[PDB]
Every structure is written in C-alpha cells, then in structure tokens.
Symmetry: D2
Subunit: 202 residues, 4 copies
C-alpha cells in the first residue's frame, strides 16, 4: 500500500506526460513549487531546516529541456536533464546518471527512479541495491514505478488532458487512490503545443 | 515465442550444492564453424582450423567468453568479458563493472541489434546483465537459484536447476542438458566451476 | 587572484591530507560543519533559505570512507565517496562521478573539482565546459586546484601536521594568502592513526 | 623519437580533418583499408593470424558518422562513433568510451587515444595507467597526440587540402618526419562538401 515516491510516464489520446507524487511518512511537510521549466519538491514554510536533516527530501522532480520532459525522485532529475540538453539519447542519459548516483544511502537503501519522454520515445529507470534497469516505455501504454513495493514498471490507464488533471490523477485517481500517505503531486503535459506544468495538493 | 527455440548465445551463472559456476554456450546459424579454447585464466571462442578469416567478416564471432580474475569468474558473449574482468581486477564491484561496460559498449551493430549479455560471480555475490536496443539491465542473481539468459528470445534472466559438480559437467549441461537440450543450433560450450578450492575451466563439443 | 573554491591533497612528512576552502563573492554567508565522517558547507544562521536560491552552495565538501578521504566543491563528494565505499578504485570513482554530473549550470559554467586519497595513492580531477581530467597526484608533492583560474593541478609546499593546521594553511597560509574572498575552510588529516577533521574561519 | 600510434585533428584554411598513423616495432606487417565510412588497420596478406597473437593490432582507426569524423588507435573508434550516431555529444562519447575501455593490458599499459570532430567542435582524449583526459581542441590550431612520449595534446601546423595530403603529412611530413618506425597512415578530410577518406603507405 505504501509505495513512497511515484512517477508515471507515457502517452494517451490527449497527449504525452510525466507525473510525480510524493508519498511520505517521516517528511510529510513538503509541497511542490513551479519555477522556470521545472517543478521542485520543497519544505513548506516553517520547515526549511529539514533539508539539513535529510539530503534527499528537496530536489527538482520535473525538468523540461526543449521537447523533452524529465521526472525523478531526486537531484538526478537535473543530472539527466542536463545530459539531454547537451546531447545524449534518453536511455543513456538515464542509465549513466543512475549508474553514477546509485541508490540513496538512507535506512532503506531507497532507490532512485526516473523517466524521460520526448516527441518520439520514452524511457523509465530505477537503480536499487540489487541492480540497475532502464527500459523503453511501451508505446501502447503509460507506466508508473515507485521507490517502494512497485520497484518495476507497471501498466496504468492514465487518463488526463492537462498537467492539472495528470497531477490530480497520480495523487488521488484510479489505482493511485489506494497508495497511502499522499502529500503533494506535480505533472508536465504536452498536447502537441509544448510542455505545461501543474501541481496538486491533498 | 514458443515456435522460436533458437536462443543464440547463452550464459548461466549461480551456485548449487556442489559449488559456484558460470557456463557459456555458442548456438549459431551463420557462424557454426567455431570452437572454444582454454588459455591462462580464460576461455576463448575462436574459428576452427580453416576458418580463421571469418573474424575479418564479422567482428562479433571471436572473443573471450570466460575470464577468471582472482576469486571472480566473468562470462559474456563478447569482448566485454575483458572490459568487465579488467575493471573487477582494478577494483570495481560486480554490478558497476557490468553496468559500466554494457552501457559503454552497447548492443552489437549487426542485422539483429544483437544484445551483449554478461554475468560475474565471486565468493559472496553474483550479477547478471544485458543491454539491448530497448534498454539496459543489471541485476543481482538470486542466492536461491542459478539463472540463465540469452541474446535471442530469453533476453531476461530465467531460473534454472543447473546440476553440475565440475566445469566439465557444467559445460555439458548448458550444451545438451536439461531445458537447454531444446535450444537449437548448439555449436560449442565452456564453463568455470569453483567447488571451494579455486576456479577450474572446461569446454565441451557436440 | 580570485580562485573561487579550492582544494588541496597530498602527503608531507607529517602525514596525508585533503584541504578545502570556500572563497566566495556572491555567497559569503556560509560556514563549515563537522558531522559523522564528513564536513559540510552550509549557510550561517539566518541565511538557510539561500540553498533554495542556488543549488550549488550547500554540500558535503569532505567525506571519510574507511581509509579514504574524499574532497570536492559539490554534492559529487558523496557520489564519489559512495562508489569508493562500494568498491571502486579512486581514478574511476572520480572519473565516473565527474563525467556524469558535469560542470555546474550557472552563469560561469563553474567546474566541479575533486580529489581522493588513501594509504597508497591519490587522484585529483576536474570537469569543465572544455573537458574532463583525472590524474594521479604526484607522490613527491601535494597539489591544489580551484574552480576559477587555477583549473589545473599545481604543486604546493603544504605544511601541516594536523587537520587544524591544514585548514588554516589553505585559508590564510603560504601562497593561499594571495587568493581573495576567503570565507571558510576545512581539512582531513591522517598521521597514520586515522582520519581527523577540522574547520577554520577567518 | 618513437611515438607509437599517432592521431591529429583540427581545421586549417582548407577544411577540417582527422589523421592517423601507425608506427610499430613488433607489428610492422600491417596496412590500412578503406571500407564504407571507415578505415581499418589490418594485417597485410600472409599475416592474418597476427590478430590472434595480439588483440590490439587490428581495428577501425577512422569512422565517419554523418557530419562527424572519429579517429582512434583501437576498437574504441566504434564505441565512440556508435554513441555519436545514437546521440551523444563528442566530449561524453569519448569520455565514456575511454573510461570504460581503459588503457590496453599489454607490456606497456599502452594508452587508448581518440578524437572526434564535427562542423562546430572537436575533442581529443587519452586514458593511461595514470589518468583520463578529454579536452576541447583549440579552434585556432590542429593538435596531435600519441600512445608513447607525446601522451598530451600538442599543437601542429598541419597543412593539407585533401585526405591524401593529410595522410601523407602525418606519415612523412613536417615534424612527423622525425617520429620513427612509420608503417601506414590514413585520414578523413572535409572541405565543406562531406568527409572523404584516403590512406598512404611508405
Ligand atoms: O521525496 C523523496 N525522494 C527521495 N527519497 C526520499 C524522499 N522523501 C523521503 N526520502 C527518503 O526515504 C526515507 C523514507 O521516507 P518516508 O518513507 O517518507 O518515511 C527517508 O529517510 C529519506 O531518506
Ligand atoms: O558468438 C557470438 N557472439 C556475439 N554475437 C554473435 C556471435 N555469433 C554471431 N553473432 C552476431 O549475431 C548475428 C547472428 O548470428 P547467428 O545467429 O549465428 O546467425 C551475426 O551477424 C553476428 O553479428
Ligand atoms: O561552494 C560552492 N561550490 C560550487 N559552486 C559554487 C559555490 N559557491 C558558489 N558557487 C557557484 O559559483 C557562482 C559564483 O559564485 P561566486 O564566485 O562566489 O560569486 C554561483 O552563482 C554558484 O552557482
Ligand atoms: O595499432 C595499435 N594500436 C594499439 N596498440 C597497439 C597497436 N600496435 C601495437 N599495439 C600495442 O603496443 C605494444 C607495443 O607495440 P610496438 O611499440 O609497435 O612494439 C603491443 O604489444 C600492443 O599491445
């Protein structure tokens, strides 16, 4: 039931997207913030100092580089987006970044997850204490992955026609309604005219 | 799927009640004139006498398929066997050695985008990996069971009750034993086995 | 004369060490903090929010993993230290981490610098918009490198017999006295009985 | 005076190029062969079996991928070219390939050298038992590097207006005339209308 941090990526009849949701037990005092071409997970007012207690709770969860949208549960969002910006195919950008940064060094060896999608293809990846996996996202269906339990891509009928709807869906919609401890969500959606961002709170 | 019993190159890795091992088998349709050769701490896949020039026709048919570096055994379907073994020798955990090598070398640029597969195992752990046109995967080998993977069809680790108590038996098994008997076009096989007193090598022919 | 962030690594008659110094014009309100097996560069009281303005000003500058000391001007200190901890020679740990993380995406394409040293060898590295370099530290002499100007290893007669002295030296000693805008420094020293840490302020 | 394998890269008033020269003491029975978009170093008739004695003597020394020319002293020519073809900037393609493949495991720890150049930029690299280096080629001057002695980029007034002239020059021209044991050379030249290849023998 508790999947921790979750991300979804893919395309539906309305367009392409990436969605992100923070689920948390020990660090629930966080929200999402939209800035230029990116969405950051940051502490809510009055909890700024939490970033000094744990180095894995504040980071950009979404980055937009040209026609590409990158989503992840950590600072590797920037590592991956930067490589894409400097010229590197999606598979290698995710693969190299995850191989180098590796799983998080906390009490649970929390995995680093990520995905990236452009106009022609998409990839999803994860690195844990047991391995590294980067795979092409099925053209026929959107998928999601999480840091706990669902540490493997899983198909999902992700319905959404805007970033607002995408963020809401991963937060409280469909099968995601059953995953516990929701805190905040964000998403990027491209209906063909460019990437738009949005966030949703409980 | 089912009607496609040709798996191409196959490797197996794991431990059983007799010890730890890596096994390799060459299955081939277009390059069946090859054999395995044992050299110092390694086993190479090479053309049989009279076909030496094939290496100049295709750069992926001759290579070391097994390398032993200290307590570690490395197995793969290409020259990345050396890339990985070298990193292990210079100090690099198994997962990263395989991951970095496969990420860099990538799938083979032939008519089928033939994947590069590999595995490595030491006294405490083992990892298996593959890189294809659709991705990269390196995973810890289950302590409870040996696994195998191939370049075609079985491009994902699969459990196997690998019975063997020596490198000779391991090579024979992946060549004609158990479920491997059903995989077509066998050519030659090799294996490394460690019963606790060190890695020993062997090859088997049809 | 402004070298930005500086690091030194090597051995002298007293032992082996790594030293780090923060020089800064736009973010001078920072100090160094010692925690378990590491030293972090963090904002001084009342400036915590600066970490949300620039993602490159707060990070562990020194990490100790067993017999190895790692020093760097960014979060790649952890990326490198983690690889060393999981088994990876110094050259590759630095090489892989810098190749993946790359130079910083600010107004100056600020390079990422790093060094690591154990009982038998040491390496130093840098990645800029013009390249990547990782090299063995000369056994005969300590060296230093910075993010601006001295973007290449340079020999230095680094005198010090403790982490306190090492931190002081890179802050105000020898040729470092001429490098401007000093803010805070830290160092790790091993006289043969283990790595000890220290920080020094102006 | 013996530099082993040598490569040059850069641009002059006539165009851009990469040049390669095999110098050898123990394996002089080799020549260069032009194939589709590539030049291979192979044994001369009657010495085919040498490839089974040493794994580092036969390989593609030049690969052309679209607007990019790649040159190297080993099979990493393909590793690098393939990454460029699949989308990867020149610096990272060379950096990743050299980091992974490393120096050659022979009696001399022979380095792996490489360079790549397209319409807007060029990079040169080397990996030895002492390190890894990938750097931007100066826009103002061509440079060369070798496996022995000149294991660092060096400026060269490389005169040539065609691949034939480029191959000849690195083989017997200018300062290269002084480097001993020449065997065979090859080059790729782009005067603006595409990459053309050529080889030259003593
Ligand atoms: O948003 C996040 N991304 C990545 N790791 C996180 C995040 N939030 C928490 N963690 C890590 O996961 C552990 C578990 O957090 P929890 O499951 O929410 O209680 C923490 O101690 C952190 O180290
Ligand atoms: O032993 C091998 N290892 C890796 N690739 C191979 C090997 N043998 C053949 N190949 C590649 O796989 C393609 C198919 O070989 P085949 O399946 O035997 O017909 C060839 O064109 C080669 O590029
Ligand atoms: O300690 C540091 N490590 C890495 N980058 C830094 C650090 N301090 C500042 N920077 C970056 O360098 C730029 C210039 O900083 P300044 O030279 O101190 O004014 C900043 O805008 C940051 O992006
Ligand atoms: O063309 C080449 N590229 C890379 N290494 C080579 C080449 N030729 C020879 N070598 C390596 O360099 C060593 C010395 O070659 P030599 O200097 O020509 O005698 C050999 O044993 C090989 O391992």
């Amino acid at each position: 039931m508790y999947l921790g941090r979750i991300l979804a990526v893919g395309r539906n009849s309305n367009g392409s997207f990436v969605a992100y949701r923070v689920s948390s037990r020990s660090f629930p005092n966080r929200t999402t913030s939209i800035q230029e071409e990116r969405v950051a997970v940051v502490p809510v007012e009055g909890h700024e100092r939490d970033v000094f207690r744990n180095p894995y709770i504040a980071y950009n969860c979404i980055r937009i580089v040209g026609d590409t949208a990158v989503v992840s549960n950590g600072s590797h969002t920037d590592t991956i987006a930067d490589k894409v910006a400097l010229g590197m195919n999606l598979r290698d950008a995710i693969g190299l970044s995850l191989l180098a940064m590796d799983y998080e060094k906390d009490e649970l060896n929390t995995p680093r997850i990520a995905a990236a999608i452009n106009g022609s293809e998409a990839f999803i990846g994860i690195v844990t204490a047991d391995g590294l996996m980067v795979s092409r996202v099925p053209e026929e269906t959107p998928v999601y992955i999480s840091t706990y339990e669902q540490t493997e891509p899983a198909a999902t009928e992700f319905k959404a026609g805007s970033p607002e709807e995408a963020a809401e869906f991963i937060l409280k919609g469909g099968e995601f309604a059953a995953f516990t401890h929701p805190v905040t969500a964000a998403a990027a959606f491209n209906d063909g005219e460019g990437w738009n961002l949005a966030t949703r709170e409980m």
